[PDB]
C-alpha cells in the first residue's frame, strides 16, 4: 500500500463523516467490509498536512504510524502464509491457574458454608441396650 | 492476494473479542451455580439419609 | 517375457494348489454326507420306535 | 473364495461400466440430439 | 456462554483448565440429578410401624429422622436468602484486566489491519501515481536508492541490487 | 442406621500460581478452622447422648 | 423375568408366556411396552425335555411338530392396537445363537418366518472393530421408514445408498487398484460412515444427536478427516451441540424434522466446530 | 531419475516385486548421499507398489 | 459353582470337544455358563504353537475398559483385528500366493505371523518333553510387546525369532544369535 490518505474535505471525498461507516470492497473477489469512522479518523492523528499529492488530493502520515501499519499488516499476512501461526492474537494466556484456584475456593467455600447450617446437632437418641430398650 | 491474505486472517481473528464476555459471564454465573449447589448437596444429604 | 514366464509359472502353483484343495474338500464333502445320512436315519429311527 | 470371487466380480464390473457410462454420457447427446431437452 | 472458552486455551495452560472444566461438570452431575425426581422418597411410617413388632427402637430412630429434616429444611430456607471471597474476586478482577488488554492490543492490530485495507483500497492505482510523489512519501526506498545510485556511480539499475543473483554475478 | 456427614469428604485447594497464594491459604486455613470446629460440634453430641 | 438354568424346565418354558401376560396389561390399557426374550432358543430345548421326558415323538434334531405353534403362539400377542382398544402395543426382540452361523437351521429359520425383521450379527465384523457388529445387508425391517423419523429419513436413505455402494466396491478395491475420483469418494464416505456407526457399550444416544452425527457424516464433514479422528470427532461435536446448540436439538425433538432454518443452523454449527478444533486432516 | 518398468495384470508372480525392491533400494541408497530422486513408471503394479 | 456374599469358587473347568466340533450340544449349553472361555485348536498345534490357544474363539468379560485400562482393551481389540484381517486372506494365499497381495496386505500378514508366534510360551511342566525352561511372563511387558509389535518396532526381525521366548528382550537376543 501507499502512504497516500485522501483528504477528508467534500471537495475531494465527498461525504466522508456524514455516516459512521465506511466500507470497502477486497481482493480479486471483492469481498465487502465495514470499518467505523472512528477507527478511520484514528489515522488523520498520524497524517501530516504539510505534504500533498496527486492533484493536492491525498496527505502522507508520518512514518512511524505507516511502517506500523505496514507491520500490522505483514504480520498478519505471514501468519496466514505459516502453518504453526498462533489460532488468536490473545497473546500469552496465563490467568487461567487464576480460575481454577477460585472456582476451586468457591466451591469448597459453599461445601464447608453448608455443613455448618447441616450440624446443628442438638441432640441424638441412640437406642442402647438395658436402658433404651 | 496480499488483500485477501489479511482479509481472511483478520475473519480469522474475529472471534478473538468474545473471550471477555465470556470471562464477564463466568463471575456472574458461578455466584449462581454455587447458590444452585448447595441446595444440591441439602438434597443429596436428604437422600443418602433417607435411603439408609 | 519375464512376466509371461512368471504367470505360466503363478498358473502351474494354482492349479496344483486348487487340485489339493478339492482333494481335501471332496474328502469333508463324503464325511458331511455320512454324516447327514447317519443323522437323519437315527432321527427316523428313534420317531419310529417313539411310538 | 465364494463371496471373495463374487464380491472382486461386482466390484470390476461395477467400475468397468461406471467408466463406460460416463463415457456414454458425455457423447451422447451429440449423436443423439432430437433427445437433448436442451434443444426442446 | 463461558464454557464456550475452550479453543483460547494453549498446551501450557491445558490441564489446569480441563480440571476447572472436569470441576464444573461435576457439579452439574450433582445438580441435574439432585433435581430431576424430586422428592419419591418421601417414607411414611404409617406401614412401619404396622408391619413391625418390636416399636422401640423405630420410635426414636423416626425422632433422629424428623429432628434432622428440620434443621435441614432450615438451613435451605436460611441460604434461600462479605468479605471472605473478594480476596479470591480480586484475582478475578485481574484476570478480566489483562484479559481486557489482550483483547484490546488484538483488537488494534486487527484494526490497523482494516486501516491498511482501507488505505490499500483508497489508494489510485501505482501506475497513475507519480514516482516522484511515491519516493516522497516513502523514506526506506529512499535511503536504498541513496545507497547504490549516490554513494556509487557503476551500480547496475535494477530494481534489487544486492539480491543473490547479482552478488554472486559481481 | 445414621447418616453423619463426614467432614473429611471435603479436599482442600491444590496451589497452582504463586498470584492465589494470598487466596489459597486464606481458604485452608479457615477450611481447618471449620474442620476442627465441626469435629467438636460432632463429638460432644455423640458423648451427650451417653452422658 | 429369569428363568435360569437350575430353575426347572416348564419355568424355562413358560417365563416368556409370563412375560408376554405381564406386558398384555400395557398393551390393553392403553400404555406402550417393550420386551426382550433372551436365550429363545433354551425354551425349544426345555420344550422338547419336558416332551421327550413325557414320552411324545420327536421330529429331527429331537424336536417336536409343535415348536411353531410354539413361538406364534408367542410372538403373535405382540401387537399394536386400535383407538378403540386404546391404542396401546407390545413390541419385541426376541434373540437367537447361532452355531457356527447356521441359519439354514430349524429353530432359526421358524422364527425367522414369522417375524417383521432381522438384526443379523457377526463375529468376523465383531472383531474387524464394527462394534455393533450389525450386518446392514442381511438385517432388514419390513415395518422400515413407517418406523423412522423424516428426520432421520433425509439422512438414513442416502447413508444406505453410500454404505450399499461401498460394499459393492470395497472388495474389488481392496486389491490396490487404482481408482477414479467417483470411487475413491464412494470408498472415503463408505469408510467414513462405518467409522461413525460404532458405539461403546451402554453408551446410547438422542434421536437428534444421532441425526446431527449423521448430518455431519453424509454432508461431507468426515471424507477429508481421518478414520481413527472421527472416534472423537464424534464425542466432541456432541459436547459442542450439548453445550452451545441445545435450541437445535430441541427444535429436532419437537417438530421431528429439518426445516431449511434448522438445516442452516446445524451447517454454520459444524462450521464453527471444525474452525474451534483441528484434526489430522 | 528412476525408470521401473512393470506390468498392469496381475498373476505375474513375483516380477514387480523384485522391480519394487531393487527401486526402493536404489532410492534408499542414493537419497542418503542427497540426490534429489524423481520416480517414473510403467504399468499400474509400481504404482500401487510405491504410492505410500 | 458361584461367588456369593460369603466366599468364592473360582472354577476352571476343561471341556472335551468331540471329532473336534464345537457344535455338540455338550460343549453348546457349557459355553452359556462360563464367565471366560479358551478355545484350543489342532491347526495352531501342528503348526508347533503352543499353547494352541485360538485368539477369536477365546473372548471373556472382563475385557471391556471399565475394568482392564483403555491401553490394554486397544491393544487387545487391534490384535484380534489384526488375526481376523489375516484369517481373510487365507484362501487367496492358499491359491494364487502372497505375491497377488498389496502391501499393506503383506505388512499385515507379516505382523499376523509375528504375533502369533510371540502368542506361544514354554511352560515349566513341559520341560519333561520340550527340555526349554519356563518363562513366567507379566502383563505390562506384553502389552509393550504387543505395541510394540502392532506399531512397526520389530519388522526388522525375522519370523521365527517370536518363537518360545516370553517377552522381547529374548526376542532381539535370539534374533542376534541367528544373524551369524
Known amino acids: 500500500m501507499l502512504n497516500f490518505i485522501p483528504k477528508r474535505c467534500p471537495s475531494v471525498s465527498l461525504l466522508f463523516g456524514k455516516r459512521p461507516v465506511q466500507r470497502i470492497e477486497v481482493g480479486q473477489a471483492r469481498h465487502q467490509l465495514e470499518i467505523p469512522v472512528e477507527t478511520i479518523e484514528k489515522i488523520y492523528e498520524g497524517v501530516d498536512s504539510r505534504l500533498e499529492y496527486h492533484n493536492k488530493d491525498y496527505n502522507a502520515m508520518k512514518w512511524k504510524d505507516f511502517m506500523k501499519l505496514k507491520l500490522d499488516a505483514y504480520h498478519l499476512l505471514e501468519a496466514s502464509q505459516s502453518e504453526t501461526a498462533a489460532k488468536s492474537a490473545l497473546s500469552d494466556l496465563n490467568w487461567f491457574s487464576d480460575l481454577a484456584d477460585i472456582y476451586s475456593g468457591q466451591q469448597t467455600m459453599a461445601e464447608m458454608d453448608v455443613a455448618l447450617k447441616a450440624q446443628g446437632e442438638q441432640k441424638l437418641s441412640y437406642p442402647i441396650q438395658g436402658k433404651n430398650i | 492476494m496480499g488483500e485477501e491474505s489479511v482479509y481472511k486472517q483478520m475473519k480469522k481473528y474475529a472471534t478473538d473479542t468474545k473471550c471477555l464476555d465470556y470471562l464477564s459471564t463466568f463471575r456472574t454465573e458461578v455466584e449462581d451455580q454455587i447458590a444452585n449447589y448447595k441446595v444440591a448437596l441439602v438434597s443429596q444429604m436428604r437422600r443418602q439419609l433417607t435411603e439408609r | 517375457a519375464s512376466e509371461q514366464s512368471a504367470r505360466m509359472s503363478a498358473m502351474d502353483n494354482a492349479s496344483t494348489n486348487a487340485g489339493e484343495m478339492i482333494s481335501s474338500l471332496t474328502l469333508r464333502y463324503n464325511r458331511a454326507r455320512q454324516a447327514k445320512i447317519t443323522t437323519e436315519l437315527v432321527e427316523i429311527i428313534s420317531g419310529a420306535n417313539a411310538l | 473364495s465364494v463371496k471373495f470371487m463374487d464380491q472382486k466380480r461386482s466390484g470390476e464390473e461395477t467400475v468397468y461400466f461406471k467408466k463406460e457410462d460416463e463415457a456414454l454420457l458425455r457423447n451422447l447427446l451429440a449423436n443423439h440430439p432430437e433427445y437433448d431437452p436442451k434443444y426442446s | 456462554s ?166 554472486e554475478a559481481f | 442406621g445414621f447418616e453423619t456427614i463426614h467432614e473429611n469428604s471435603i479436599k482442600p485447594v491444590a496451589p497452582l500460581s504463586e498470584n492465589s497464594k494470598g487466596f489459597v491459604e486464606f481458604v485452608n486455613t479457615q477450611l481447618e478452622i471449620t474442620k476442627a470446629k465441626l469435629r467438636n460440634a460432632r463429638l460432644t453430641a455423640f458423648a451427650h447422648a451417653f452422658v | 423375568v429369569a428363568a435360569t438354568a437350575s430353575e426347572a424346565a416348564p419355568l424355562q418354558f413358560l417365563a416368556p408366556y409370563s412375560g408376554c401376560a405381564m406386558g398384555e396389561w400395557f398393551r390393553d390399557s392403553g400404555r406402550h411396552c417393550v420386551i426382550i426374550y433372551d436365550d429363545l432358543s433354551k425354551q425349544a430345548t426345555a420344550y422338547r425335555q419336558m416332551s421327550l421326558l413325557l414320552r411324545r415323538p420327536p421330529g429331527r434334531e429331537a424336536y417336536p411338530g409343535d415348536v411353531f405353534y410354539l413361538h406364534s403362539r408367542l410372538l403373535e400377542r405382540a401387537a399394536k392396537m386400535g383407538d378403540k382398544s386404546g391404542g396401546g402395543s407390545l413390541t419385541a426382540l426376541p434373540v437367537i445363537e447361532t452355531q457356527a452361523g447356521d441359519v439354514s437351521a430349524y429353530i432359526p429359520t421358524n422364527v425367522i418366518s414369522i417375524t417383521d425383521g432381522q438384526i443379523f450379527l457377526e463375529t468376523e465384523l465383531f472383531y474387524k472393530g464394527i462394534r455393533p457388529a450389525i450386518n446392514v445387508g442381511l438385517s432388514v425391517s419390513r415395518v422400515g421408514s413407517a418406523a423412522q423419523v423424516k428426520a432421520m429419513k433425509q439422512v438414513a436413505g442416502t447413508m444406505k445408498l453410500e454404505l450399499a455402494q461401498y460394499r459393492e466396491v470395497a472388495a474389488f478395491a481392496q486389491f490396490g487398484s487404482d481408482l477414479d475420483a467417483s470411487t475413491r469418494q464412494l470408498l472415503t464416505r463408505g469408510t467414513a460412515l462405518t467409522e461413525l456407526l460404532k458405539q461403546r457399550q451402554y453408551s446410547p444416544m438422542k434421536n437428534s444427536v444421532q441425526v446431527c452425527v449423521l448430518y455431519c457424516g453424509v454432508k461431507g464433514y468426515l471424507d477429508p478427516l481421518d478414520p481413527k479422528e472421527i472416534s472423537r470427532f464424534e464425542s466432541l461435536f456432541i459436547d459442542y451441540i450439548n453445550a452451545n446448540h441445545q435450541d437445535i436439538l430441541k427444535t429436532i425433538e419437537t417438530e421431528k424434522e429439518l426445516s431449511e432454518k434448522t438445516e442452516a443452523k446445524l451447517r454454520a454449527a459444524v462450521d464453527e466446530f471444525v474452525a474451534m478444533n483441528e484434526f489430522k486432516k | 531419475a528412476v525408470l521401473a518398468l512393470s506390468s498392469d495384470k496381475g498373476l505375474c508372480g513375483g516380477v514387480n516385486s523384485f522391480v519394487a525392491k531393487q527401486a526402493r533400494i536404489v532410492i534408499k541408497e542414493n537419497e542418503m548421499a542427497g540426490n534429489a530422486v524423481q520416480v517414473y513408471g510403467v504399468g499400474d503394479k509400481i504404482r500401487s507398489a510405491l504410492q505410500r | 459353582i458361584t461367588t456369593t456374599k460369603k466366599g468364592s469358587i473360582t472354577s476352571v473347568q476343561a471341556v472335551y470337544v468331540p471329532a473336534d466340533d464345537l ?158
Open chain 9, 23 to 180: 457344535t455338540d450340544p455338550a460343549p453348546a449349553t457349557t459355553f452359556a455358563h462360563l464367565d471366560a472361555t479358551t478355545v484350543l485348536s489342532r491347526q495352531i498345534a501342528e503348526l508347533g504353537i503352543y499353547p494352541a490357544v485360538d485368539p477369536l474363539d477365546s473372548t471373556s468379560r472382563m475385557l471391556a475398559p471399565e475394568i482392564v485400562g483403555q491401553e490394554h482393551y486397544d491393544t487387545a481389540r487391534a490384535t484380534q483385528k489384526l488375526l481376523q484381517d489375516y484369517k481373510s486372506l487365507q484362501d487367496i494365499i492358499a491359491i494364487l500366493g502372497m505375491d497377488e497381495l498389496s502391501e499393506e496386505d503383506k505388512l499385515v500378514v507379516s505382523r499376523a505371523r509375528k504375533i502369533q508366534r510371540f502368542l506361544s510360551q514354554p511352560f515349566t511342566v513341559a520341560e519333561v518333553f520340550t527340555g526349554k525352561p519356563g518363562r513366567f511372563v507379566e502383563l505390562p511387558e506384553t502389552i509393550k510387546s504387543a505395541q510394540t509389535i502392532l506399531r512397526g518396532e520389530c519388522d526388522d526381525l525375522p519370523e521365527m525369532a517370536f518363537y518360545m521366548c516370553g517377552g522381547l528382550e529374548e526376542v532381539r537376543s535370539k534374533a542376534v544369535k541367528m544373524a551369524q
Open chain 5, 2 to 167: 463461558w464454557m464456550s472458552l475452550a479453543p483460547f486455551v494453549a498446551p501450557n495452560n491445558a490441564a489446569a483448565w480441563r480440571k476447572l472444566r472436569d470441576g464444573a461438570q461435576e457439579v452439574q452431575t450433582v445438580i441435574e440429578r439432585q433435581s430431576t425426581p424430586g422428592k419419591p422418597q418421601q417414607i411414611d411410617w404409617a406401614k412401619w410401624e404396622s408391619q413391625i413388632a418390636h416399636k422401640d427402637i423405630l420410635n426414636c430412630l423416626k425422632t433422629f429422622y424428623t429432628n434432622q429434616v428440620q434443621i435441614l429444611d432450615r438451613a435451605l430456607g436460611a441460604l434461600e436468602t462479605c468479605e471472605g471471597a473478594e480476596k479470591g474476586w480480586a484475582l478475578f478482577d485481574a484476570a478480566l484486566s489483562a484479559c481486557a488488554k489482550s483483547v484490546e492490543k488484538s483488537e488494534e492490530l486487527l484494526s490497523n489491519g482494516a486501516r491498511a485495507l482501507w488505505v490499500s483500497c483508497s489508494n489510485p492505482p501505482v501506475w497513475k501515481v507519480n514516482t516522484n510523489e511515491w519516493l516522497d512519501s516513502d523514506q526506506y526506498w529512499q535511503a536504498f536508492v541513496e545507497k547504490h545510485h549516490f554513494y556509487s556511480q557503476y551500480q547496475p539499475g535494477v530494481v534489487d541490487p544486492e539480491a543473490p543473483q547479482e552478488v
